[PDB]
Write a protein that binds this DNA or RNA. Structure first.
Length: 50
RNA sequence: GUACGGCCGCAAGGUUAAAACUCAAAUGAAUUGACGGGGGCCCGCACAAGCGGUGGAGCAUGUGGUUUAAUUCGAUGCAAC
RNA sequence: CGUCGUAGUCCGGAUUGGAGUCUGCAACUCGACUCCAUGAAGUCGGAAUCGCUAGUAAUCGUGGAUCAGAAUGCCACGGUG
RNA sequence: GGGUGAUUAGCUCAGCUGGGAGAGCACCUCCCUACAAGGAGGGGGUCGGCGGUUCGAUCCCGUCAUCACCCACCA
RNA sequence: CGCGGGGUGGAGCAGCCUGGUAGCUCGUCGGGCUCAUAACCCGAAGGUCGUCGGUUCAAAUCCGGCCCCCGCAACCA
RNA sequence: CCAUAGGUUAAUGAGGCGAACCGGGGGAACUGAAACAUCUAAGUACCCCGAGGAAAAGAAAUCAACCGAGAUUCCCCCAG
RNA sequence: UUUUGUAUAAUGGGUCAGCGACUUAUAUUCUGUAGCAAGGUUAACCGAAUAGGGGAGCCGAAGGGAAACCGAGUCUUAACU
RNA sequence: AGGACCGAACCGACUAAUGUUGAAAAAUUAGCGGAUGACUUGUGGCUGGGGGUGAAAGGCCAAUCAAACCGGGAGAUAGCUGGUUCUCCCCGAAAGCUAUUUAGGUAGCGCCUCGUGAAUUCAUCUCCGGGGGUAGAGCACUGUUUCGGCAAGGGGGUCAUCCCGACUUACCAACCCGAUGCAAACUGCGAAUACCGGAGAAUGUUAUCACGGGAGACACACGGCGGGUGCUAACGUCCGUC
RNA sequence: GUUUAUUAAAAACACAGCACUGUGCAAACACGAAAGUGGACGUAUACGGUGUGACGCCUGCCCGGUGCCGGAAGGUUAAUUGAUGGGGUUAGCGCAAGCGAAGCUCUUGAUCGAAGCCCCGGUAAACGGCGGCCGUAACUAUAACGGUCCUAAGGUAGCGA
RNA sequence: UGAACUCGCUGUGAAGAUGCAGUGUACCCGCGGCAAGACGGAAAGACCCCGUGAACCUUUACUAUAGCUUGACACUGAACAUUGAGCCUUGAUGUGUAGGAUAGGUGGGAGGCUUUGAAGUGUGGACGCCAGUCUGCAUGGAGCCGACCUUGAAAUACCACCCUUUAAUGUUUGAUGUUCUAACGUUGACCCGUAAUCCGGGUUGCGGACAGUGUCUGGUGGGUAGUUUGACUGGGGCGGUCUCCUCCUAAAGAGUAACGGAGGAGCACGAAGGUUGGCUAAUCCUGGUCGGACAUCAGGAGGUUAGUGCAAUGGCAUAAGCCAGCUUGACUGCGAGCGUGACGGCGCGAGCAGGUGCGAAAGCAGGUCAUAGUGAUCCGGUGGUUCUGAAUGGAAGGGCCAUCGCUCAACGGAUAAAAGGUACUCCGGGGAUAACAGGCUGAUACCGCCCAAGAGUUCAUAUCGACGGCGGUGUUUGGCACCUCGAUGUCGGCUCAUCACAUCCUGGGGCUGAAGUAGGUCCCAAGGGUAUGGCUGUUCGCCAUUUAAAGUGGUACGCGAGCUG
RNA sequence: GCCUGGCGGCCGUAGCGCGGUGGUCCCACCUGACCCCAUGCCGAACUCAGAAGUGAAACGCCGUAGCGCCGAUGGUAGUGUGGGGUCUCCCCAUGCGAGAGUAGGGAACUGCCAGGC
């Protein structure tokens, strides 16, 4: 048994992602996270695994 | 036909064949019942099948088990309660 | 003729809550009746096995015997069939 | 000598937070029906002996003895 | 010394390992076929699935001790 | 039959020997990898064949890099 | 001689004699010493084989960065910090 | 006739004895035994190294053999073994840390040492300040505990159910009054000594530091002291420590 | 009869006979890096492989595992076949992005097939295997007995401190 | 064969003296004869233990191979038939609905086409809108078709392109069998070389597209061969431990040993993070409906004796505990410096820019209450890359930047690939390490004394003793690991010594539950004494008969340079 | 001197028991609640506006040497270094020295600012 790491995609319109461990057996519903990005040098939301 | 020896067989076997112990018996025939998953003709409501029930609830009225001081003694398959 | 409408309740009535009817020496405990509320079980019954046939089954009325007092029991009468 | 168990009815024995007398067969009697069957009540218990504790030692636990069965010495 | 398991109606053995959940045969207590018993058939009565805490929607089941056991191995110099 | 295998006669070539070197053939294990198989060690060791005064190589369907080389072998280097 | 440690009942020695052991081979560097010095040095070979030539090649004086690329600077870097 | 009874020649190993630096590379003396056979033997051949030969012991294979003998790779390899040199001097270790197919070696730290450059290296005494909980002391809190008394509730037993329900607490355990033992794992207290640095006196060592070169050791043993362990035993055991 | 030279001599080994297995003969089988020979100038009353041990009386069950045979229909399935598509290059095309003809070079995987193995049946005189627990008579004790966990199945005949 | 004026004790000593301490004994050397002693001699011990030594014994360890088995393709052929499989080739197709009319799709379109072909229209076969077409007939046999009429996006001669389903001809390729020689073969026969069993040449039969063999290859194969094959432990095996975290033993710094004393980890929370605002327990008692025995919360009594992701340690209400909002700082790239381990690795942190969030602002925010939650190096796969790929330009490839993973967990990891056994071995080292013996100790062992619950019909102590205590002994069973593994013969059997005294017998006698004879018990004493028969490897044991006894112990539990084995 | 409030310092001499004591001043109760503000509901809390009531609770001071707390001198426990022995203890030399109690101390002291007499 493992919680597994999933990739949330940046609102920068690219394939760039942030990985987090998110167990489908405790919280399967979608998540969106605000983080800093050093390429746009400002904060963006990372959302959804597909 | 159990035991012992002798004879005979490749062998399974073939032959001779007791004693002790124990019981008023073993056994042939004919006779009449009764019994059968036996026979033939047959009847019963017995089987069957068209229905009603008792078996489940609560209450009553008898019989066992349980129990005390007595909780009475028998009847108790068809033939009781 | 109106009215309710398969419901563990609407139908069903047990152990209740209260006051009354009665015989007798006397019904607290073992008896019956009545009136006004309350209320449990009860949705045709386990295996199995029991009884029948026209005025018979089922169904609804009445009397009487036993008896100080009390039986849906016992013995007779009749309607619907 | 020592080791580990047993000691409760003739023979076999049950009973592990310490409140234990009970069963089978053995021995009699009654009802059964004349007996066996079936049913019931009785006769017989050092629950081994002796210390410490205690409300009290089948159990906390020391020791004596008999039965059980087993050792030491060459490895 | 332990290791892995077991903890079940009276006896012997299932289920478990998937919480929505105590079972079968021999027995014990009666019904049915019987004259009568057994088989067979239909019914009943029964287990705190060790013990105290914990975790939980919940604990015979998981988690920690304690406690009683089964089996395997209890000899190497 | 002719023929030819076979038979005979004459001639040439080889044969055996000689120190070391040398082309080709057969071909390890140890050793190192502080351990072992690939890799290293080694085409060594030893054995075999064969041959010359030397054996072996060569002047390109080779080697470079747009510059060009213009046979091979031997030496110092390229280069740890 | 072995050992922390042996007069040691711990191994060893009959005795005299001839014998018997840390090197040179190569690369690089540290030290010494010296020549030259931002330079130093030659190898094979040539040659008058202990002269003189031969500087091919090597060691050195510039660094930063995987590297492209930059250079008294440079990589990190939007950068100055 | 004979895988027949005894038995010369012929063969031959079983018992016994002698021998055992011998006569001896296996014999000698006496006996029992093999002797038409699955036998024995004269003479010459044939079977070879993981191959032979074996009615089969890994016995025999020229004395050798869980793999013969000689010559080569080979002076293979040995964290081991021991052999490792004539004469005066300067400084002066270790058997500890950390890692390793690690507990026989080796590698970073501790300990030894030579050169080079720049230089005093240190402690004891007194007092002041600072981080400090061992020794001792203790019962407050934890856990444990004795003695005396009261004792909720739980676990056990009993009799009443009318007397205000009552007796009992050997067991498990809360409250409480009065006392006492234990503690590495506790604290209503805590030294001696040690260690760090000032303020101050006294004494004498060429020192300390960096760089550039070499090491040696990381299996020692013992008496005392500080503590566990062992039977408050061992020339026993495991450490600290002088 | 055989058994090792000088401490290990018999019960071990061989033998008369017993069984199973391979062999139709240019046998099967073996040695020979082979040329060849042995098998054997033997031919099923004859040879190769392995165990048994004269003679007399004699031979229970198990094919799950590991071997072997009968069946090859089915499954599993390889090298190989290599339908489809992609990567590299390139004449060429478009403003660029981005596209791209042919030939080459790499690559992919639609999918087939032998033997084995599995599957079905047999094979133990093939290598082998032949188990436990619980309860139970009319004293003690035992169980002819009944169950129960399991295995491929868990001992007919004979011997036994 | 070290040198030797090499006598005995009790001590000491790497603990057995000859050589050291004390003490005791002795004239010296030949001749013959014997051996207790000189840790004996020949052999670096075989055996026991340790171990990044060797060799066998084995096995689906790793790997290979002889032997065997499997298929295409080749030396190596003519062809024939019958057909499994794939593939090419071709025809029928094709409608509804309303109307002549089955327009398949679709691109062209008036002179062009069918003779192996159309009609009939059905008997009968498939399909079916029952019409029609095909298989093949009854059967004929060069045509035909368009206008007018009218459907529809679209036309009905003539001619391309595209197809479902399906069979036969063809074709590639496996089977089944067919004849027949020529690759191949004869362990057939004959003639000749040749008074030759081989070989060569010829002859004449019979086999054979078989065999034999090769390239490549699926599979097998301990028969043969090379190699790998964990550790700690005041002994081994089972068990435990092996990397990470904490406390105590542990010493008024740290380190610091013991299967000394005891517990945890190899992750989880997008929330339980951030920040601003508000608040804070336990426990008992009292008291009250819908509530079956108990669901309510208010008050007092009182406590930092509640809560926190978990070990133990310590923190925490200024809360890190419980909530309310806003929120995502669970921030990026970096960094003076400090602490720390030998390094790997890591914690703390001033300072800079950029972008967020809470708040009035100060101030805080580059994660959770802290201490455990992994796998390097090597590398396969993949996306990017205005780094590079050495003839030039691309590019397999190498680098850089993203993305992931080996319980390799023997954890700090010996290699795309490695397991067991040796009493059949065997090598280097050793009492560093056990066994038979020497030392140390005396719990164990046997005994006495202090003392006394009791037994001894009274009575504790004649004789005997549960309990507690303190010794006598060297001495056993064990503990222990010093001197011993270049080699101390072990058990029993025979044959034969020396010293003790803890006395079995022999001499002495005491106490007594001793009148006497005895029994029970005590101690002065080691001068003399202390069997034999049967069974067994034999002590140990048992049995029968003898005896003043049928004593105990030390001497490696005495006598292998003694006998037996 | 005295009284109080804030920041506090020091933190038991600052404690406990029991008693006394203040409303000019400050301090708390108190007296009300639109608005800004607040409530999973509420002027309860938070918050505002103030003087009719009071010196109670709350806040602050103080007497009291009974106990806590601090604790001399003497002795004790322990101990650094040294000598011995009768040996995990004792004896000696030479230094250090708690813990508890006693006598004594002690019912504090104070920096900055501000109000009051």
């Amino acid at each position: 048994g493992i919680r597994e790491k999933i990739k949330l995609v940046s609102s920068a319109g690219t394939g760039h992602f942030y990985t987090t461990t998110k167990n489908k057996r405790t919280k399967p519903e979608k998540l969106e996270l605000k983080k800093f990005d050093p390429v746009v040098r400002q904060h963006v939301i990372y959302k959804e695994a597909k």
